Amino acid sequence: DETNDNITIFTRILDGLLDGYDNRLRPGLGERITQVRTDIYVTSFGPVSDTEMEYTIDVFFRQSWKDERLRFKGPMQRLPLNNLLASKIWTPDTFFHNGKKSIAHNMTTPNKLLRLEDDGTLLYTMRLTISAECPMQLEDFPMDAHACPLKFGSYAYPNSEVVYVWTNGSTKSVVVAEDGSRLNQYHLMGQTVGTENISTSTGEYTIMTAHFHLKRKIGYFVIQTYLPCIMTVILSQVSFWLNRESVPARTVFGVTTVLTMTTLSISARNSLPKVAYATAMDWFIAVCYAFVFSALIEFATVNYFTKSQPAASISKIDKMSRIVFPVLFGTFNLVYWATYLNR
Amino acid sequence: NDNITIFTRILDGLLDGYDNRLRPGLGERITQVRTDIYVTSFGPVSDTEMEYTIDVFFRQSWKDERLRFKGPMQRLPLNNLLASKIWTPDTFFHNGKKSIAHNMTTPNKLLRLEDDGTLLYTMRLTISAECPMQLEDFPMDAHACPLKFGSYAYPNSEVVYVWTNGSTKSVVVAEDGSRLNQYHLMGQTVGTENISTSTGEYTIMTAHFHLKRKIGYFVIQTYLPCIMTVILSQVSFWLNRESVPARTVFGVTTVLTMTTLSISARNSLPKVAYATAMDWFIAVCYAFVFSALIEFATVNYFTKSQAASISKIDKMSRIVFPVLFGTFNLVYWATYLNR
Amino acid sequence: PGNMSFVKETVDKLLKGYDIRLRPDFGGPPVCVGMNIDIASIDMVSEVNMDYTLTMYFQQYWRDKRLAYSGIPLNLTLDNRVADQLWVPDTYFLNDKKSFVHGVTVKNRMIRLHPDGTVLYGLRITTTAACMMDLRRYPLDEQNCTLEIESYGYTTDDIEFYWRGGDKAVTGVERIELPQFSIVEHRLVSRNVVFATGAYPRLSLSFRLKRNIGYFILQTYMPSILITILSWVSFWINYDASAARVALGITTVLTMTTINTHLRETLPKIPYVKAIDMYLMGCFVFVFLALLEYAFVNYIFFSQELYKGRAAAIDRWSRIVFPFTFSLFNLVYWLYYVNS
Amino acid sequence: PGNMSFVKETVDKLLKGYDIRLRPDFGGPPVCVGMNIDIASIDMVSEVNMDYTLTMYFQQYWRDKRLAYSGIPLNLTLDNRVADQLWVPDTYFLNDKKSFVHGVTVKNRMIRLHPDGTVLYGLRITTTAACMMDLRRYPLDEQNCTLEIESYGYTTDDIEFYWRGGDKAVTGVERIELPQFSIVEHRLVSRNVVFATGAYPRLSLSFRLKRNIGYFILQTYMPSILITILSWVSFWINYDASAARVALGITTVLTMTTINTHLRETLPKIPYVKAIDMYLMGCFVFVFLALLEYAFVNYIFFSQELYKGRAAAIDRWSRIVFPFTFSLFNLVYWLYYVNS
Amino acid sequence: PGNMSFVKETVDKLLKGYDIRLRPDFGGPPVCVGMNIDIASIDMVSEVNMDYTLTMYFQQYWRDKRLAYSGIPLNLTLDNRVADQLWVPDTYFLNDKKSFVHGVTVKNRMIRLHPDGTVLYGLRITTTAACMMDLRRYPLDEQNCTLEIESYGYTTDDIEFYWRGGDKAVTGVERIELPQFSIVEHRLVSRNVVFATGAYPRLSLSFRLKRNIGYFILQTYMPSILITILSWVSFWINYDASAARVALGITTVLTMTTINTHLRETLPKIPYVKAIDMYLMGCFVFVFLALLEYAFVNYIFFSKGRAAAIDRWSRIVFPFTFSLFNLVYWLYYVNS
Ligand SMILES: *[C@@H]1O[C@H](CO)[C@@H](O[C@@H]2O[C@H](CO)[C@@H](O)[C@H](O[C@@H]3O[C@H](CO[C@H]4O[C@H](CO)[C@@H](O)[C@H](O[C@H]5O[C@H](CO)[C@@H](O)[C@H](O)[C@@H]5O)[C@@H]4O)[C@@H](O)[C@H](O[C@H]4O[C@H](CO)[C@@H](O)[C@H](O)[C@@H]4O)[C@@H]3O)[C@H]2NC(C)=O)[C@H](O)[C@H]1NC(C)=O
Ligand SMILES: *[C@@H]1O[C@H](CO)[C@@H](O[C@@H]2O[C@H](CO)[C@@H](O[C@@H]3O[C@H](CO[C@H]4O[C@H](CO)[C@@H](O)[C@H](O[C@H]5O[C@H](CO)[C@@H](O)[C@H](O)[C@@H]5O)[C@@H]4O)[C@@H](O)[C@H](O[C@H]4O[C@H](CO)[C@@H](O)[C@H](O)[C@@H]4O)[C@@H]3O)[C@H](O)[C@H]2NC(C)=O)[C@H](O)[C@H]1NC(C)=O
Ligand SMILES: *[C@@H]1O[C@H](CO)[C@@H](O[C@@H]2O[C@H](CO)[C@@H](O[C@@H]3O[C@H](CO[C@H]4O[C@H](CO)[C@@H](O)[C@H](O[C@H]5O[C@H](CO)[C@@H](O)[C@H](O)[C@@H]5O)[C@@H]4O)[C@@H](O)[C@H](O[C@H]4O[C@H](CO)[C@@H](O)[C@H](O)[C@@H]4O)[C@@H]3O)[C@H](O)[C@H]2NC(C)=O)[C@H](O)[C@H]1NC(C)=O
Ligand SMILES: *[C@@H]1O[C@H](CO)[C@@H](O[C@@H]2O[C@H](CO)[C@@H](O[C@@H]3O[C@H](CO)[C@@H](O)[C@H](O)[C@@H]3O)[C@H](O)[C@H]2NC(C)=O)[C@H](O)[C@H]1NC(C)=O
Ligand SMILES: *[C@@H]1O[C@H](CO)[C@@H](O[C@@H]2O[C@H](CO)[C@@H](O)[C@H](O)[C@H]2NC(C)=O)[C@H](O)[C@H]1NC(C)=O
Ligand SMILES: *[C@@H]1O[C@H](CO[C@@H]2O[C@H](CO)[C@@H](O)[C@H](O)[C@H]2NC(C)=O)[C@@H](O)[C@H](O)[C@H]1NC(C)=O
Ligand SMILES: *[C@@H]1O[C@H](CO)[C@@H](O)[C@H](O)[C@H]1NC(C)=O
Ligand SMILES: [Zn+2]
């Protein structure tokens, strides 16, 4: 409709829109706080890296503010702006506090969008991949839960000049795509949203915060670590039912199962991150090694007394260790799983 | 006024009529470029990739008579907004794999101009360069990693490079710059060359860094475990021959131990196509441990499968095996360590 | 008189009115772009990525009459940033995975103008190129990795490539030192790719690589051969010593998997079977069969003096069969994967 | 007259008065962008990262009446540096993780104009795209990795996409091989997707990848099968030979542990249960049970005609129960993961 | 009233005749650049590279009389792109290997002017800095390495560096925690340096790192100790049990080899001898001697009171000497 004029006024408005405008200055620099409304759409979450204490998230990041100096007049109530204008219009310098490294996608023209409206409101959207720091406690390694945060805010403009608010409410703004749960180690419980002020040598600032809650999937470690260790302990304990006079046989059970435990302790370290305290899994492996070690020491004492004191009652030791070892290992398991499951 | 306005109007008076596409003295003379290097840090040497990293302040000086000026100051620093409008040589490192010209809080570049027209151009670089290695003598080898650089476009007939002092005072290594883990750095050599290529003849500056590997790590990690595992597999000649399972378990397990040692030893090196000095040692050790169990098989056969048994083999191997291993050890070290 | 003031205006009056959007003699016959390469090194060859990294000096010669000049005897060499102001061909490598022009000090480019209008434009490039590899013969394999050079936008109606100097156009290959390979030969090809109405010029450079076996002999084959030989020692131990023959057997089984396991940790991780795998599993079967041999001997000895004879006789056969059959398998292996 | 001036002024005339800030046929119907792809190669597929990498020639084709020119019969091929002076669709790849246009020698782009204002715009792109991979059936699995093409700023009211050429708009997929996978089929889809800010046009390209299992049969399944069979050798060794029955058993457990530990260190780290893990743990139980079998026999032999009768009877049953249960386990495993 | 025009007029009035090539107070006294740092995090520390990664909010202060204004009673914060149109000091981190300024949405810079002319110029920088590591006491070692700040082009007669707030000038070091290390202390130093081109100002920031030992106690030392103790079980088994004595002794040699080789590949590659190497090889010798001890007693027996006498002294000598070895080891690598 009104084709020839419709194109003419579009370029006529957009070309003259930038006269009398200084992009080095805020809207209402000396009069008002510049309120910025934000939103996020998470295209993908993860992968999460325990060794590097980081995670990767893909987001369409939306920002909206009203600039009185860009109030155009025309038939169209909304007006897309070309990127040539986007680089010559003031935009917030929002940055992410947690960002290790980030990509503002740049493929086939930049992934940026800037719209303008009759009342001067600007809508600025742009696609990001954020690699964010997630400090995580690890005392419960295989059974732990985490909340990796995402924090962002203005860099230069302090709390008295720019403030950030969630556009459609705190928890009603952020959205995660249905396909976006791109995790293999973890299962995403959900997310929560909030905001807070902070203070620095350069002044106060307002932060926007969003936590993504995670719970680790235990299934892998049961078949990888716990079972081979549990079975290996059952092997070391069956040696008590063998005859005491088969010294070469009794010996190789004790030593070989120790060697089997040694191999099973190699993989645990590789699956773990490099943290410097004993995790719940390290308790298990250390105790399993104790049972396997003490089983062969049990034979050593039985061997000594039956050889140095032969009609001796040394057979008592086998009959006691046959019940003691399985039971005491059982109570350790009940204590171990009760301690960390009901947690 | 006389100390502020004069300075800026001199700079603006240099570039009108100037042409940065042309080297000084197109046909009149050869452009002399004087260079020197200060190595802030050296290493690491990635012998698994036959490359090394060097961090240098690279400095170049030449005379451009078009920038000759007159004023109260004998020299003045320019700024990088003006350095890009002035001709500078196309110096490059012939054997460089990947280099960083540092760009952090403005470029790490400096350009100073004397009133005579001389220019001093300085910049900080992190250079990863090729260093081919003769890893035949791997544990006790030595290397001379070169750093060759020269003009890319302008041939010897137009631009020539000379070390600033034309002597040892042209390459300087910081006292704390030796960031080397597995090498020592005994000395350096500075030279010059001409070469001919498809595009003309070029003059090259060369600097060689002489390296010597640390023996200590490999002795404790490889040689000692291998020697002890071979001292074992020979104590069995003093075990009673009658207890067959003890002799068999002993020998077969030490073969497995050597297998693990051999498996871990190859964790090093770039996986080159030929046997290094490690393979000379490890392969022969695996031979002694292997033959030490074939020794049991023959002596076992002639007592349990005869009784007119033979005791020569067990009693002789107590001498022959230690002597043969001792002779091999002496020859091996006499060959590689006297190098 | 013949000073740089004359040259300044000469170069300017070449660039004034010069248009980079139009190739030489636009609308006329094609541009004959001659090419030349000086191989600096082959930084890497990797099977896991099926690619190799190549560093080279890449030169391109063409004649652009718009840049003709007279009165200056010299073959002018200009600051490399003049490249942003001249027309240069859009040559690109078809099979490159990632490439970059070196940038230290100043971008490694070159332009030299000759009086008759010839332009010599060269630049130093490092390129990772894709080379599909037939690893079925892994230790005994041979590869033909090539670098393909093509024009992106212009068909043969506009641009014609040719190797400058014929077979001499590429140099530096004799001075390469690959760790696991050796250059057998290289061939230069010039051709016109044609499909539909658009004929496209292409040049290609091929290297034939032969792998050196020395590493694998000492650390793959011989360790497995001696373990296989060592398992036969059980046939010479007396069958009554069950605790010994079993210990020798199962432990050599453990060694075979130990060798195979950690070779898997050090050989390239390409998920498809190769010649090296067929050998390690060939040995693993012989070691496995060496332990099944006693299972029959021991059972026959106790599951009974005839059965004293049967247990002894099976050994005497196995001491003949096992060395013979392994050598037969060994001989066949070093013929199928040599003749093929 | 003359090409050098006629063409040069024509291109200047087209751009003089142009506005890249405004889309073709603004105010009118959506500009219809046709697309096609020539896939050079699929570089890699990463389960640990859950992504795959393409290299492709991505072409777009639309009409802009502002670029109509008359008189010249040629389809003008312009320099790739002109692409920054014209309007081009703001297309982007939705599931892209990291991508770049190749730039060696010169930026790999092309623009061809035609007399009637239709523009062809080509790029050579390397892109790493996320792919959802379900490894629960690994390594017996197949995957459906896709590439998503979408317009960023414009709704379906301003931009429309379509596969130029229909179902044959993507080529080169039939010319590609991978080490681990083989492409069963590929499919093309076009859709209008509505979400928070408007109805968007989207084009989707999908590949079905079927894994090659020969690598794993040789490295994982057969080793476990043979080591499991060596465990049954214990039942055939006389029960009086305690030192033999034992060393075979515990060493087999250590042999099985070594295989399980290092396999999962070499093969990609995917921390959740997979089909291969169910098999390996299933074998660990058989090696587990084959050694508890002796411990039951040894106690019955020494501690509790029963001493010779029961001890030999348990072996006699174990010689058939264990092989049969392992045959049943394999039958259930294969007909589950392969035929169900 | 029409303030947006007033401020635009003022800011443009600052840029009239501004030359980027001239420093403040040109020709006169040096420009004093005060500095301040906020450590966002101390990232991976790697021995194999001899460097560590650091993220910080690097800030600089100075006065430029060309930029003073009187009309507006506000500290004007300006867009990030104004930093390319002002004179900023030529600072660089001498010991950095690779570093970059963050650009998540716009490059993380800050330019804030004040009426009196002071310019606050802030950057958010992630930098990998060379860290000279002496790992001969690893893992019982302390590590000191620094961030080195220096000017490139200007000597001390043109520019001066100083810390703002003295020892208070750096924050964030009191809250960061690393997996392998803990921050014992940090120090700030300011000094002048004489260099090949002239005398230069410098600032130095240093951290003292103490490694966490709890990881190596559980994972490296205790496994070695238990195997070594387990080897002494041989001396209690009767010496006539040849098949049992050898199977125990030789297997503890094998499992020692297993742990040594798999620790070698998982730990960082540092091809020179360290404390653990002296401990791991020490345990290997004790395990080696325990097996060599059996070959000694077996020879005497098969050729008895002396055979038992050897078997009984070793039961006390081996535990005694290993405890002495531990006492010498821990004493040496803890105190000297
Ligand atoms: C690594 O791999 C390469 C591919 O496997 C090996 O072979 C080269 O591969 C290229 C393709 O990448 C191939 O073209 C080339 O073959 C030689 O090419 C020469 C150029 O000839 C061209 O123009 C001819 C125009 O008439 C045309 O006929 C040629 O082939 C086309 O037409 C024929 C006939 O219709 C068709 O059969 C063919 O399929 C093509 O459509 C081609 O387009 C050419 O010199 C040469 O042989 C011809 O020319 C000779 C001289 O005139 C004659 O004597 C001869 O009889 C032929 O007519 C080849 O055809 C080969 N290159 C070689 C040397 O074989 C690489 O060798 C390998 N590299 C290494 C190091 O191992
Ligand atoms: C990998 O995995 C992906 C994701 O699962 C697979 O992608 C899917 O492929 C199938 C084909 O195998 C696609 O189905 C086809 O889709 C198109 C487009 O339909 C859509 O767009 C239309 C235009 O906007 C729209 O009208 C459609 O609306 C549907 O819903 C409305 C109700 O709301 C209904 O009225 C309509 O009738 C539609 O059902 C829809 O949005 C379409 O052309 C195809 O239909 C034709 O073909 C079928 C063949 O049976 C025929 O029955 C029809 O009559 C018609 O001729 C067809 O539905 C599907 O869209 C893809 N899914 C996604 C999410 O993209 C992919 O195939 C996998 N790869 C491999 C290699 O296997
Ligand atoms: C990691 O390792 C590094 C390297 O070893 C450590 O860095 C060193 O830290 C120490 C402090 O722990 C530094 O020494 C201090 O330096 C200052 C400055 O002295 C300089 O500047 C003065 C002007 O400001 C000037 O007067 C000084 O000149 C005198 O001293 C020199 C040198 O002796 C002498 O030649 C002259 O003739 C003068 O006598 C000098 O140029 C100084 O303040 C410190 O204390 C001195 O001064 C105070 C008074 O201000 C006084 O009370 C003290 O008693 C003392 O006299 C101190 O000397 C040292 O420079 C750093 N070394 C390097 C190479 O940078 C780092 O600390 C370690 N990290 C950790 C965490 O520990
Ligand atoms: C991302 O995509 C862009 C566009 O294809 C790539 O080229 C860059 O394009 C921008 C404009 O979009 C150029 O900006 C220039 O800046 C000034 C100030 O506005 C002005 O003089 C010019 O008109 C122009 O717009 C920019 O120089 C250009 N960059 C390059 C290297 O050519 C860009 O490279 C892609 N990558 C990134 C990381 O941006
Ligand atoms: C963050 O700081 C802002 C500064 O504006 C606070 O907003 C003020 O809050 C007080 C009450 O605490 C109100 O009386 C003021 O009117 C608010 N100011 C404005 C301009 O609205 C805000 O409350 C602080 N937020 C937090 C979470 O501490
Ligand atoms: C590199 O070549 C130069 C060439 O310089 C000429 O050398 C001859 C012989 O000494 C002399 O007579 C000419 O005057 C020189 N010409 C100029 C213009 O200087 C040699 O001088 C160098 O020694 C050669 N370098 C090496 C390492 O051989
Ligand atoms: C180098 O720093 C300058 C400072 O102005 C900047 O313009 C340029 O982009 C930087 N270059 C790189 C490669 O970072
Ligand atoms: Zn291993």
Return the domain boundaries, chain A.
3-217, 220-341
B241 contacts B314 by C-beta, under 8 angstroms: yes
A293 contacts E255 by C-beta, under 8 angstroms: no
| Residue A272 exposure: Cα atoms within 13 Å on the Cβ side | 25
Using DSSP, state whether E9 is helix, strand or coil.
Answer: helix
- Mark yes or no for CB contact E93/B104 under 8 Å: yes
Nearest to E240, CA basis, from E315, E304, E293: E304
Is there a binding annotation on residue C284?
Answer: no
Give phi and psi for D311, each to the nearest 5: -60, -45
Residue B198 and residue C164: Cα distance in Å, rounded?
11
Question: Which of D161, D189, D192, D208 gets mutated to test ligand 2 (max ligand atoms within 8 A of its CB)?
Answer: D189
D190 contacts D203 by C-beta, under 8 angstroms: yes
Nearest to E209, CA basis, from E244, E192, E184: E184
Contacts (Cβ under 8 Å, ≥6 apart) of C39:
C54, C55, C56, C170, C171, C172, C173, C176
Task: Tell me which fold the domain A220-341 belongs to.
Answer: Methane Monooxygenase Hydroxylase; Chain G, domain 1 (1.20.58)
Domain E214-335 has CATH 1.20.58.390: yes
Ligand 4 midpoint to CA D132 (Å): 33
Q: Whose CA is nearest to atom 28 of ligand 5?
A: A197
Residue E109 and residue E79: Cα distance in Å, rounded?
9
Q: A315-341 and A227-238 are packed helices; what angle lies between their axes, rounded to 10 degrees?
A: 170
CA angle B138, C46, D218 (to 5 degrees): 100
C66 sits in which H/E element: none
Ligand 6 midpoint to CA B36 (Å): 21
CA-based diameter of chain B, in Å?
A: 118
- Mark yes or no for CB contact C215/B274 under 8 Å: yes
Ligand nearest to the CA of D90: 4
CATH number of E3-211: 2.70.170.10
CA angle A302, A308, A314 (to 5 degrees): 35
Residue C210 and residue B315: Cα distance in Å, rounded?
50
| Cα D320 to chain centroid, rounded | 43
Pairing verdict, β A203-216 and A186-200: antiparallel
Residue E84 per-residue DSSP state: G
Residue E60 and residue E35: Cα distance in Å, rounded?
5
Residue D90 and residue D102: Cα distance in Å, rounded?
18
Q: Indicate where chain E has its CATH 2.70.170.10 domain(s).
A: 3-211
E319 sits in which H/E element: helix E305-335
Give phi and psi for D205, each to the nearest 5: -125, 130
Give the mutation candidate from A85, A184, A222 for the D interface (greatest D CB count, under 10 A).
Answer: A184
Which residues on adjacent β-strands are paired with residue B114? Answer: B75
Give phi and psi for E327, each to the nearest 5: -60, -45
Which two structure tokens, joined as six digits, stand for D134? 């379900």
Give phi and psi for C28, each to the nearest 5: -95, -160
Closest residue on chain E to B241 (Cα): E302
Alpha helices in A58-148 (DSSP H): 83-86
Residue B100 and residue B85: Cα distance in Å, rounded?
22
In Å, how far are A113, B149, C109, D204 from C105, measured between CA atoms? 37, 11, 11, 45
- Tokens 């070196």 locate to C102
Residue A258 and residue A252: Cα distance in Å, rounded?
10
Residue type, D4: M
Closest residue on chain A to D256 (Cα): A260
- Mark yes or no for CB contact D3/C26 under 8 Å: yes
Sign of CA dihedral D301, D306, D312, D316: negative
Nearest to E57, CA basis, from E187, E171, E160: E171
- Mark yes or no for CB contact E252/A93 under 8 Å: no
CA distance E271 to chain B (A): 5
D237 contacts D293 by C-beta, under 8 angstroms: no
Q: Whose CA is nearest to atom 17 of ligand 1?
A: C189
- Tokens 């930084």 locate to C43
E10 contacts E77 by C-beta, under 8 angstroms: no
Which two structure tokens, joined as six digits, stand for B332? 């091996």
CATH number of A3-217: 2.70.170.10
Residue E272 per-residue DSSP state: S
CA distance B4 to chain E (A): 7
Is there a binding annotation on residue A322?
Answer: no
- Mark yes or no for CB contact E92/B105 under 8 Å: yes
E77 contacts A161 by C-beta, under 8 angstroms: yes
Using CB atoms, pick whichever of D99, D269, D292 lies closest to residue A107: D99
Name every chain B residue with its beta carbon within 8 A of the beta carbon of C36. Answer: 198
CA angle E27, E28, E31 (to 5 degrees): 105
Residue D267 and residue D180: Cα distance in Å, rounded?
12
B335 in contact with ligand 6, CB cutoff 6 A = no
Resolution reading in Å: 3.1
Domain C4-211 classification at class level: mainly beta
Which two structure tokens, joined as six digits, stand for D161? 């996409």
C239 contacts C311 by C-beta, under 8 angstroms: yes
Which residues on adjacent β-strands are paired with residue D206? Answer: D146, D187
Which residues on adjacent β-strands are paired with residue D171? Answer: D38
Q: Which long-range contacts (CB under 8 A, 24 or more apart) does B308-315 make?
A: B314/B237, B314/B241
Give phi and psi for B265, each to the nearest 5: -65, -40
Q: Whose CA is nearest to atom 2 of ligand 6?
A: B194
Nearest to C232, CA basis, from E169, B293, D253, E243: B293
Q: Whose CA is nearest to atom 13 of ligand 4?
A: D84
B236 contacts E299 by C-beta, under 8 angstroms: no
Residue type, C201: P
Residue C101 and residue C91: Cα distance in Å, rounded?
14
Closest residue on chain B to E260 (Cα): B221
Ligand 5 midpoint to CA E248 (Å): 74
Ligand 2 midpoint to CA E226 (Å): 65
Number of A–E residue contacts, CB under 8 Å: 166
- Mark yes or no for CB contact A24/E82 under 8 Å: yes
CATH number of D214-337: 1.20.58.390
Chain E CB within 8 Å of residue B243 CB: yes
Residue C88 and residue C100: Cα distance in Å, rounded?
17
B95 contacts B129 by C-beta, under 8 angstroms: yes
Nearest to B148, CA basis, from B41, B273, B231, B35: B35
Ligand 2 midpoint to CA E334 (Å): 71
CA distance E89 to chain B (A): 8
CA distance C6 to chain D (A): 27
Residues with CB under 6 A from ligand 2: D 144, 146, 185, 187, 189, 191-192, 204, 206, 208
Residue D245 and residue D234: Cα distance in Å, rounded?
5
Residue type, A318: D
Residue A246 and residue D303: Cα distance in Å, rounded?
13
Q: Indicate where chain D has its CATH 1.20.58.390 domain(s).
A: 214-337
Q: E242-266 and A247-271 are packed helices; what angle lies between their axes, rounded to 10 degrees?
A: 10
Which two structure tokens, joined as six digits, stand for A126? 């742009």
Chain C adjacent subunits, 3+ CB pairs under 8 A: B, D
Residue type, A209: T
Residue A155 per-residue DSSP state: S
- Mark yes or no for CB contact A260/D257 under 8 Å: yes
B83 burial level (CB within 10 Å; 0-12, 13-18, 19+)? middle
Closest residue on chain B to E240 (Cα): B243
Strands (E), chain C: 31-46, 51-63, 76-78, 91-93, 96-101, 109-113, 118-130, 142-151, 159-163, 170-171, 181-195, 198-211
Q: Whose CA is nearest to atom 2 of ligand 5?
A: A197
Task: Tell me which fold the domain B5-202 belongs to.
Answer: Acetylcholine Binding Protein; Chain: A, (2.70.170)
Sign of CA dihedral D116, D117, D118, D124: positive
Name every chain D residue with its beta carbon within 8 A of the beta carbon of C250. Answer: 230, 247-248, 251-252, 255
Contacts (Cβ under 8 Å, ≥6 apart) of E168:
none
In Å, how far are B211, E161, E328 from E190, measured between CA atoms? 36, 8, 42
Residue A6 and residue D22: Cα distance in Å, rounded?
12
CATH number of B217-336: 1.20.58.390
Residue C92 and residue D55: Cα distance in Å, rounded?
14
CA distance E222 to chain A (A): 10
Name every chain E residue with its beta carbon within 8 A of the beta carbon of A24. Answer: 11, 78-79, 81-82
Using DSSP, state whether A278 is helix, strand or coil.
Answer: coil
Residue B149 and residue B204: Cα distance in Å, rounded?
6
Superfamily in which the C214-339 domain is placed by CATH: Neurotransmitter-gated ion-channel transmembrane domain (1.20.58.390)
Kindly report the length of chain C: 340
Residue type, D214: G
| Residue A255 exposure: Cα atoms within 13 Å on the Cβ side | 30
How many of the other CB atoms lie within 10 Å of CB of B141? 19
Using CB atoms, pick whichever of B110, B181, B232 lies closest to residue E271: B181
In Å, how far are B84, C27, C155, D74 from D112, measured between CA atoms? 35, 15, 12, 10
A193 burial level (CB within 10 Å; 0-12, 13-18, 19+)? middle
Atom of ligand 6 nearest to the CA of B157: 18
Ligand 5 midpoint to CA A210 (Å): 20
Atom of ligand 1 nearest to the CA of C204: 12
